[PDB]
Swiss-Prot record, chain A:
The modification Phosphothreonine is found at T1025, T1362. This is U5 small nuclear ribonucleoprotein 200 kDa helicase. It comes from Homo sapiens. The gene is SNRNP200. The lineage of its organism: Eukaryota, Metazoa, Chordata, Craniata, Vertebrata. Changing R234A: Strongly decreases ATP-dependent RNA helicase activity. ATP binds at residues 100-107, 947-954. GO terms for biological process: cis assembly of pre-catalytic spliceosome; mRNA splicing, via spliceosome; osteoblast differentiation; spliceosome conformational change to release U4 (or U4atac) and U1 (or U11).
Swiss-Prot record, chain B:
Residues 235-269 are annotated as: Required for interaction with EFTUD2 and SNRNP200. Plays a role in pre-mRNA splicing as core component of precatalytic, catalytic and postcatalytic spliceosomal complexes, both of the predominant U2-type spliceosome and the minor U12-type spliceosome. Functions as a scaffold that mediates the ordered assembly of spliceosomal proteins and snRNAs. Required for the assembly of the U4/U6-U5 tri-snRNP complex, a building block of the spliceosome. Functions as a scaffold that positions spliceosomal U2, U5 and U6 snRNAs at splice sites on pre-mRNA substrates, so that splicing can occur. Interacts with both the 5' and the 3' splice site. The gene is PRPF8. It comes from the Eukaryota. It is linked to Retinitis pigmentosa 13: A retinal dystrophy belonging to the group of pigmentary retinopathies. Retinitis pigmentosa is characterized by retinal pigment deposits visible on fundus examination and primary loss of rod photoreceptor cells followed by secondary loss of cone photoreceptors. Patients typically have night vision blindness and loss of midperipheral visual field. As their condition progresses, they lose their far peripheral visual field and eventually central vision as well. It is found in: Nucleus; Nucleus speckle. Part of the U5 snRNP complex. Component of the U4/U6-U5 tri-snRNP complex composed of the U4, U6 and U5 snRNAs and at least PRPF3, PRPF4, PRPF6, PRPF8, PRPF31, SNRNP200, TXNL4A, SNRNP40, DDX23, CD2BP2, PPIH, SNU13, EFTUD2, SART1 and USP39. Component of the U5.U4atac/U6atac snRNP complexes in U12-dependent spliceosomes. Within the minor spliceosome, which acts on U12-type introns, interacts with PPIL2 and RBM48. Core component of U2-type precatalytic, catalytic and postcatalytic spliceosomal complexes. Found in a mRNA splicing-dependent exon junction complex (EJC) with SRRM1. Widely expressed. This is Pre-mRNA-processing-splicing factor 8. Changing R244G: In RP13; reduces interaction with SNRNP200 and EFTUD2. The chain holds residues 2067 to 2335 of 2335 of the full protein. The MPN (JAB/Mov34) domain mediates interaction with TSSC4 and SNRNP200. Has structural similarity with deubiquitinating enzymes, but lacks the residues that would bind the catalytic metal ion. Contains a region with structural similarity to reverse transcriptase, presenting the classical thumb, fingers and palm architecture, but lacks enzyme activity, since the essential metal-binding residues are not conserved.
């Protein structure tokens, strides 16, 4: 049924955690009410401990398991309750709930629950190996977290397990806390950090989470804990991998409800203990005051304090918790002046004059605080404000009982643990800047501070006295005796909670939303007490499961999120869509009203003056108001602020604004109200300002993203930029800083000065050294740029960041963060931006970032490349990129129109024998083919056909081949493809197409010169890869089998653009030269993808424009739907992980029932992604949806398998393909896919080229990959990406084909631009140049410099140079410009070649090959290689040296380095015959040395590096022989 | 200026300068026709208006070339900002002219400056300034270089373009007195010239190398003989934090103020 909208206002509980859901309470046993004038006073006695059960004893630290016993030292026996549940603690993974009173020592129970998991992973020869598990301890308070990590560290240190607080900003400390286990945090911290995904790299390594003080469910903070646990549970149901959950709570009813919530089996998992189990029995005193007038009340409570304190003035100890900072000492001195007004009565707090150590209190005299007044007498004060160390010095004084009266704050109860014989809580009311008013303090605050009552050791029984308002007197009884219900405040926050779940992708639609809410505490409470939660029993009967209420609920949240633009959700589908605003909102924990306020208020043109106002309008501050009394000070503050507020008068906006400024300007405030307020404002300000920055940056508005990041920094650091950056190093003296600020000497001018010159400015030379340290500690980047135009629309930028600063991890820490953003001409628009992060290891290593930027019609004077530290203030470097000399490429002519033709039947070629190899495959040729046909088949001339991959150009080549077939019986044809994989793929087809049916012999070239020579000339069709056809055919003059070829075919010629392109270029060019000399024409047919500059390629390869067909990517036999998915997570693991769910969804959306291929960045990633596809397949409630046959049919195929997981993944219809799989395994998977048995295959990226099985939908996951050599990720080569995309083609059946490309934020626009447009292609020969000139000089094809220039004119480079001169660093388009350029080129190539002794240059004109060059050319070895050889090999060199010398060879630097191969190769290098001299383990030469020795020692390695070994060996012998020579 | 209150009024004012940006007027008056005609790309104009202030004159130096085969029109392709400070009626900028590589390709066309109150004449301070540049610089051609005065009209901006006449140039070379009415000043000294705004091409900025351009907030740090280098990057706004160090360097505080309110509540990260 259709949902209905409801009001969430009257449906929440105001004054939460003070709620008191029950309106009735109970006595304890001996309790009495005695009412006095103006105040009722209630008394309850101490509880009576339950008598020890029959044969129930405590457990010593002996009789519990061997390992766990460690770290319990100092403690001989277990507490009664600890001893009660230790069994279920260490013997079961069953979830726990304990309810036990404050003081029972609950922690040490949970500790055991940890020591179990710590024990779950253990080894004999090593203990507690720590990369298997991590534990999460959630504690309610900060002080408690701090101190807990403090003591937990000490305790667990015997194991050497590393436990730390999670205070980390996300990015700097993740890789830091990566190595951290058992991490302690506040529920909130865990929630943001999970919303960002900092957790999703941690999880699945988490077997245990502790919820400590889980009764915080009742607090306003409650919804957070509810959000955590709900997520954890709802998640476990998907993953099927479980987690222990250990709840700790104060003793309160609703225990079974919290049990249901934590999925604790009540049978074996539930634990309850009542208030009688408090170790020190508690006598409770509660005095409620009836006085309405506060003026009289502030007397009455004083007097109650006095009488109560004089009651204990004998031998005993009192502790006063005031909720004020200053009143800690205002309460004291009142007691003092009263005791003086008592005529020295109440004094003598000791056993005598000298007795009880009054010299203790007197001799401690001089101290930081006001204590000097109080200490001579019997009492003192404690709190965080006045001192640091003297707090510890007071705590020492209280423990030893030299002070029997101590007045303090709640942070003393929450911090380091000391009790008091009797404690007294004054007033219970506090000031809430969040609520804008005063309110009674929280449940946990009293519970904590009154649970400090009585000592465990020196005490018999404790008492406590709560002085409150009579109206709340009932409430505080329902707590400290278990009357109080624990209820959920979840409804208030429901819209914010829902958003963040959509943001994480954990809820797609309304249904998933109700499913989620079904995991909430509020759900079980709405179930078991509908009467309270707004459900009448009749409509509850009408809907027992609350399906319709949970549908109504969340519908209003959906509407709220839609109205504020966090989500786009239409009522019809019930589906949600996230917006970037929504993500920003979730990530900063900012409410959805604030975020829409920002959406409407924020505009590009905002001044700082206005930025502050917009900040002040944040809905988070809604209750902050301006009080009459403080409007006196606010005015003064208003005139002492730097940023004009004056837009606003006194109203909340002004107060909040002037407050933020006051905090940044570092100003102290007289009023207490304002202080607390300011604190609130500034603490929330970080997240607020940051979400502003993120938004305004995503929009691209340059100026305001500057103003906002700078504000962020100014808040973080508590200073304005106008102050010296040296201040962010707190290590520095204040007077020195102020001194350098005195004289104005711009900061970046400190680098020029040495240690002495620095001190000379401020005339404080003694400081000269130290200052210098800091100046060079301050993060500094220098940056260079290499810019080349790609198309008239886009330029390419290579930014080289070189660290200029000295790294210190006690300052810069593990990582340093920088935004690089390229801004347009006016510094107005941000054309592009990346988050660049330089890790610890890599300071001093220059990082290379490559990115493209657009240019526009009024070509501008320059762009700017800005780089700025995230956290660091006043730390920035700008780099003007000037276009003053830029020469943009010629705009590219329109692609030849696809004519509308009668689709050609196979019946065209009058040859029947030809028709046979087509007709039973497809009835008609596609429009591309039919348009090319007459030209390529019926005519003899050179053609060029570009069409985007998947267009069928192969049979276009086959046309020309058939023509040649008619031409001559013995007619010879050579066919080239740049990819060896693609080559074998062609050979398998053409061998059956020709040799089988047409009897014409078909061959495929190989490594060896001899065998290859013999191969051609016997064959009609010679299939080869550019390198094979370079070495052979360089010598072509002598080999008649090269010259006599009829047809020459270049497939995928656009690949010229990529590396190992020059060799392709050079062989096609050479081919032309041959056809020049042979006097017979040799037809050339070239095939490319869509090429913008196809004209040049054709002109080069000698095609008339009339026979040139260049088609637009929109011309494809089967139309393609391309979608690009941006992910804003830069850290690659997190990104890759967070695109897991979208993969499944991309299938269910775009191609639910049709074949799907998924390409992945890693060899291993293929497994993992097949798994994840299966585990989130369960989620859908739909299992094995991708398997189209029964399990009985797959058995014959599965018998052939080694890999055990592959069996599983295949069993559910997935399966994967990669490097390590046996060719039989691969063939099998391919068979299963194409036959239609399995609907989805995950494949390694490397297999994009050589894969013979196509699909309907293709999903590319994460276009970067990892390179060990520079230790960075690098983008997929574009042609690869286009190939993967072309792998969605199924012309036989589908009317469409689909592709989803999930990539990083940076890389989004690039794909949006270049996947749709035809591609430009440029020559690389200019760079890879020497080898060929050398080889050609050897053949005497270049006899002298002139011949060299002439040779150059036969190339594609020659063509392109004048087309886009700025790319080749040619500065003009002119004649003598190009001429001078080619001249300088052969000049330096021949020089460099002569320097290397590969050639001799005579008269300055002629050239001749020398020994070296001759060798090089003969064996096809890089010239630098054999030069290295030449300076390395000496008279005394032997195999030890020959190993390393042959290893350093250039052809071995193609060997790559994988993820963490620095340890792997070290472990191998340890055990090899020859060690090395301080080897770097990311260097491929070292790796090939080690792999080579490994091969010589016949060591069997992993197949991963074994493949590598085989490749090394392939080319080894040649190199060796060259050494012989 | 009052140096306290005077700073802030104008400071929150200038945050609206970008509003002017889209209402501008250009003097159309009698065209000599033997003269050059200057085209100003609109983008640099916008940005130049946006960095300015409504009291202190800021100035910028014009650099451009004439389009191929069209020698009688000068496209202004670049504005250079140098260390400078203004009065309400004039602008003090240093003796050194811009030297830099991106500039070598173009010729100097003169300068442009903001003019708090609109006057239908070239202020004596200007003709004198210009002549005195020209005296010391042969690089500047009398006939080719101009003064573009950009005045702030209500809610708007409005601009005119002047050339010195030789009478004017001589007077100005000679002139000492910088008052608003010097002896021997004449309307015969200057001439209006033809100028057009354009959206057809984009101009770019050159800006000081180790500092920014705006010295108004440090007058003692500015000198006629001061030297500077340049870079390709845009100007910061007038009241930008950097131009104003003395004000962000106002902190006199003792750290222990932080002792008060030592309740640290954070709980988030």
């Amino acid at each position: 049924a259709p949902r209905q909208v409801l009001d969430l206002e009257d449906l929440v509980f105001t004054q939460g955690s003070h709620f008191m859901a029950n309106k009735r309470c109970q006595l304890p046993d001996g309790s009495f009410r005695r009412q006095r004038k103006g105040y009722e006073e209630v008394h309850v006695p101490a509880l009576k401990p339950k008598p020890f059960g029959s044969e129930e004893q405590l457990l010593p630290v002996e009789k519990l398991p061997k390992y766990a016993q460690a770290g319990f030292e100092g403690f001989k026996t277990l507490n009664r309750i600890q001893s009660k549940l230790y069994r279920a603690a260490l013997e079961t993974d069953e979830n726990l709930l304990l309810c036990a009173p404050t003081g029972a020592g609950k922690t040490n129970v949970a500790l055991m629950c940890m020591l179990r998991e710590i024990g779950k992973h253990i080894n004999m020869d090593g203990t507690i190996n720590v990369d298997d598990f991590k534990i999460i301890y959630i504690a309610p308070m900060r002080s408690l977290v701090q101190e807990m990590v403090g003591s937990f560290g000490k305790r667990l240190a015997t194991y050497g397990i590393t436990v730390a607080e999670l205070t980390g900003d996300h990015q700097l400390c993740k890789e830091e806390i990566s190595a951290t286990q058992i991490i302690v945090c506040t529920p909130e911290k865990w929630d943001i950090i999970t919303r960002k995904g900092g957790e999703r790299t941690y999880t699945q390594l988490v077997r245990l989470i502790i919820l400590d003080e889980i009764h915080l469910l009742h607090d306003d903070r409650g919804p957070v804990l509810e959000a955590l646990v709900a997520r954890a549970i709802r998640n476990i149901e998907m993953t099927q991998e479980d987690v222990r959950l250990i709840g700790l709570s104060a003793t309160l009813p609703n225990y079974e409800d919290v049990a249901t919530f934590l999925r604790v089996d009540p049978a074996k998992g539930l634990f309850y203990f009542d208030n009688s189990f408090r170790p020190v029995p508690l006598e409770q005193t509660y005095v409620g005051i009836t006085e309405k007038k506060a003026i009289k009340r502030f007397q009455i409570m004083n007097e109650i304090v006095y009488e109560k304190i004089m009651e204990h003035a004998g031998k005993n100890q009192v502790l006063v918790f005031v909720h004020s900072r200053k009143e800690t000492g205002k309460t004291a001195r009142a007691i003092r002046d009263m005791c003086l007004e008592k005529d020295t009565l109440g004094l003598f707090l000791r056993e005598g004059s000298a007795s009880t150590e009054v010299l203790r209190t007197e001799a401690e005299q001089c101290k930081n605080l006001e204590l000097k007044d109080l200490l001579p007498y019997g009492f003192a004060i404690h709190h965080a404000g006045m001192t640091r160390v003297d707090r510890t010095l007071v705590e020492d004084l209280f423990a030893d009982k030299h002070i029997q009266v101590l007045v303090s704050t709640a942070t003393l109860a929450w911090g380091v643990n000391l009790p008091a014989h009797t404690v007294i809580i004054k007033g219970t009311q506090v000031y809430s800047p969040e609520k804008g008013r005063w309110t009674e303090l929280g449940a946990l605050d009293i519970l904590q501070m009154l649970g400090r009552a009585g000592r465990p050791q020196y005490d018999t029984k404790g008492e406590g006295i709560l002085i409150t308002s009579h109206g709340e007197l009932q409430y505080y009884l329902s707590l400290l005796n278990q009357q109080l219900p624990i209820e959920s405040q979840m409804v208030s926050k429901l819209p914010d909670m829902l958003n963040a779940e959509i943001v994480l992708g954990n809820v797609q639609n309304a249904k998933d939303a109700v499913n989620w809410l079904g995991y909430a505490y509020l759900y079980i409470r709405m179930l078991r007490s509908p009467t309270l939660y707004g459900i009448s029993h009749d409509d509850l009967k009408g809907d027992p499961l609350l399906d319709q209420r949970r549908l109504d609920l969340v519908h209003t949240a959906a509407l709220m999120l839609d109205k504020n633009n966090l989500v786009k959700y239409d009522k019809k589908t019930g589906n949600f869509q996230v917006t970037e605003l929504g993500r920003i909102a979730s990530h900063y924990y900012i409410t959805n009203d604030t975020v829409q306020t920002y959406n409407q208020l924020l505009k590009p043109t905002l001044s700082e003056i206005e930025l502050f106002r917009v900040f002040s309008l944040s809905s988070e501050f809604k209750n902050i108001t301006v009080r009459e009394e403080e409007k006196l000070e606010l005015q003064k503050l208003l005139e002492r602020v730097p940023i004009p507020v004056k837009e606003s008068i006194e109203e909340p906006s002004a107060k909040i604004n002037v407050l933020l400024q006051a905090f940044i300007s570092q100003l102290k405030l007289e009023g207490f109200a304002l202080m607390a307020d300011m604190v609130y404002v500034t603490q929330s300000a970080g997240r607020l300002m940051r979400a502003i920055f993120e938004i305004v940056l995503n929009r691209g508005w340059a100026q305001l993203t500057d103003k906002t990041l700078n504000l962020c920094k100014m808040i973080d650091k508590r200073m304005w930029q106008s102050m010296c950056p040296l201040r962010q190093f707190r290590k520095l003296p204040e007077e020195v800083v102020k001194k350098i600020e005195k004289k104005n000497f711009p900061f970046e001018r400190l680098y020029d000065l040495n240690h002495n010159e620095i001190g000379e400015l401020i005339r404080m030379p003694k400081m000269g050294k130290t200052i210098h340290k800091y100046v060079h500690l301050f993060p500094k980047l220098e940056l260079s740029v290499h810019l080349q135009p790609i198309t008239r629309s886009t330029l390419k930028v290579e930014l080289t960041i070189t660290p200029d600063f000295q790294w210190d991890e006690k300052v810069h820490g593990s990582s340093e963060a920088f935004w690089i953003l390229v801004e347009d001409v006016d510094s107005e628009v941000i054309l592009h931006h990346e988050y660049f992060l330089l890790k610890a290891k890599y300071a001093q290593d220059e990082h290379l970032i490559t990115f493209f930027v657009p240019v526009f019609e009024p070509l501008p004077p320059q762009y700017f490349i800005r780089v700025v530290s995230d956290r660091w203030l006043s730390c920035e470097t700008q780099l003007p990129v000037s276009f003053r000399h830029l020469i943009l490429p010629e705009k590219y002519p329109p692609p030849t129109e696809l004519l509308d033709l009668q689709p050609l039947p196979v019946s065209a070629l009058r040859n029947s024998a030809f028709e046979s190899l087509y007709q039973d495959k497809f009835p008609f040729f596609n429009p591309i083919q039919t348009q090319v046909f007459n030209t390529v088949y019926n005519s003899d001339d050179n053609v060029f056909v570009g069409a985007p991959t998947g267009s069928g150009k192969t049979i276009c080549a086959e046309f020309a081949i058939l023509r040649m077939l008619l031409q001559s019986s013995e007619g010879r044809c050579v066919y080239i493809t740049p990819m060896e994989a693609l080559a074998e793929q062609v050979y398998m087809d053409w061998y059956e197409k020709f040799q089988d049916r047409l009897n014409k012999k078909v061959v495929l070239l190989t490594g060896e010169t001899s065998t290859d020579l013999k191969l051609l000339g016997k064959g009609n069709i010679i299939i080869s890869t550019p390198e094979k056809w370079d070495i052979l055919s360089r010598r072509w003059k002598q080999r008649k089998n090269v010259q006599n070829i009829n047809l020459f075919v270049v497939d995928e010629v656009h690949l010229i653009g990529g590396e190992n392109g020059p060799v392709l270029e050079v062989i096609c060019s050479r081919m032309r030269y041959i056809s020049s000399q042979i006097e017979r024409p040799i037809r050339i047919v070239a095939l490319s993808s869509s090429l913008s500059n196809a004209k040049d390629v054709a002109h080069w390869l000698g095609c008339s424009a009339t026979s040139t067909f260049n088609f637009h990517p929109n011309v494809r036999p089967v139309p393609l739907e391309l979608h690009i998915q941006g992910f804003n997570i830069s850290h690659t693991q997190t990104r890759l992980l967070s695109m897991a769910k979208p993969v499944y969804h991309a299938i269910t959306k775009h191609s639910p029932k049709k074949p799907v291929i998924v390409f992945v960045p890693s060899r291993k990633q293929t497994r993992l992604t097949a798994i994840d596809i299966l585990t989130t397949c369960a989620a859908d409630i739909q299992r094995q949806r991708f398997l189209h046959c029964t399990e009985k049919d797959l058995i014959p195929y599965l018998e052939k398998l080694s890999d055990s997981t592959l069996k599983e993944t295949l069993l559910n219809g997935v399966g994967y393909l990669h490097e390590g799989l046996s060719p039989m395994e691969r063939r099998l998977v391919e068979q299963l896919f194409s036959s239609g048995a399995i609907q989805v295959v995950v494949a390694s990226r490397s297999l994009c080229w050589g894969m013979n099985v196509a699909a309907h939908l293709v999903i590319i996951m994460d276009t970067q990959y990892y390179n060990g050599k520079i230790h960075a990720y690098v983008d997929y080569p574009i042609y690869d990406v286009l190939q993967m995309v072309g792998h969605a083609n199924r012309p036989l059946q589908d009317d469409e084909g689909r592709c989803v490309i999930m990539c990083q934020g940076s890389k989004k626009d690039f794909f949006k631009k270049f996947l749709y447009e035809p591609l430009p292609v440029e020559s690389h020969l200019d760079h890879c140049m020497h080898d060929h000139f050398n080889a050609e000089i050897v053949t005497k094809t270049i006899e002298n410099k002139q011949d060299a220039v002439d040779y150059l004119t036969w190339t594609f480079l020659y063509r392109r140079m004048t087309q886009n001169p700025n790319y080749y660093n040619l500065q003009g388009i002119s004649h003598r410009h190009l001429s001078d350029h080619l001249s300088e080129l052969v000049e330096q190539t021949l020089s460099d070649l002569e320097q290397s002794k590969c050639i001799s240059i005579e008269d300055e004109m002629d050239v001749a090959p020398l020994n070296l060059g001759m060798i090089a050319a003969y064996y096809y070895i890089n010239y630098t290689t054999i030069e290295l050889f030449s300076m390395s090999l000496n008279a005394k060199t032997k195999v030890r040296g020959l190993i390393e010398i042959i290893s350093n060879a250039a052809e071995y630097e193609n060997i790559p380095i994988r993820h963490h191969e620095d340890n792997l190769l070290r472990q191998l290098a340890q055990k090899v015959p020859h060690k090395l001299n301080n080897p770097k383990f990311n260097d491929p030469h070292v790796k090939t040395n080690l792999l080579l020795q490994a091969h010589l020692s016949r060591m069997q390695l992993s197949a991963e590096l074994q493949s590598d070994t085989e490749e090394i060996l392939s080319k080894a012998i040649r190199l060796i022989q060259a050494c012989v020579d | 200026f009052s140096s306290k209150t005077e700073w802030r009024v104008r400071a929150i004012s200038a945050a609206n300068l970008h509003l002017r940006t889209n209402h501008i007027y250009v003097s159309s008056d009698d065209i000599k026709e033997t003269g050059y005609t200057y085209i100003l790309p609109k983008n640099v104009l916008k940005k130049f208006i946006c960095i300015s202030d409504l009291r202190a004159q800021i100035a910028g130096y014009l650099y451009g070339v004439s389009p191929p085969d069209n020698p009688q029109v000068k496209e202004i392709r670049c504005i250079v900002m140098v260390p400078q400070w203004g009065t309400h009626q004039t602008v003090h900028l240093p003796g050194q002219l811009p030297q830099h590589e991106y500039l070598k390709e173009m010729e100097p066309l003169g300068w442009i400056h903001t003019q708090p109150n609109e006057s239908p004449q070239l202020s004596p301070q200007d003709v004198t300034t210009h002549a005195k540049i020209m005296a010391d610089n042969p690089s500047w051609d009398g006939e080719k270089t101009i003064i573009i005065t950009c005045s702030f009209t209500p809610g708007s901006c409005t601009l005119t373009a002047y050339k010195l006449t030789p009478s004017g140039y001589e007077w100005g070379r000679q002139n000492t007195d910088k008052g608003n009415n010097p002896k021997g000043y004449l309307p015969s000294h200057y001439e209006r010239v033809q100028m057009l705004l354009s959206d057809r091409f984009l101009g770019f900025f050159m800006v000081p190398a180790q500092s920014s351009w705006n010295y108004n907030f440090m007058g003692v740090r500015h000198d006629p003989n001061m030297k500077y280098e340049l870079q390709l990057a845009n100007p910061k706004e007038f009241y930008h934090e950097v131009h104003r160090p003395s004000h962000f360097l106002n902190f006199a505080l003792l750290q222990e103020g932080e002792v008060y309110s030592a309740d640290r509540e954070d709980l988030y990260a």
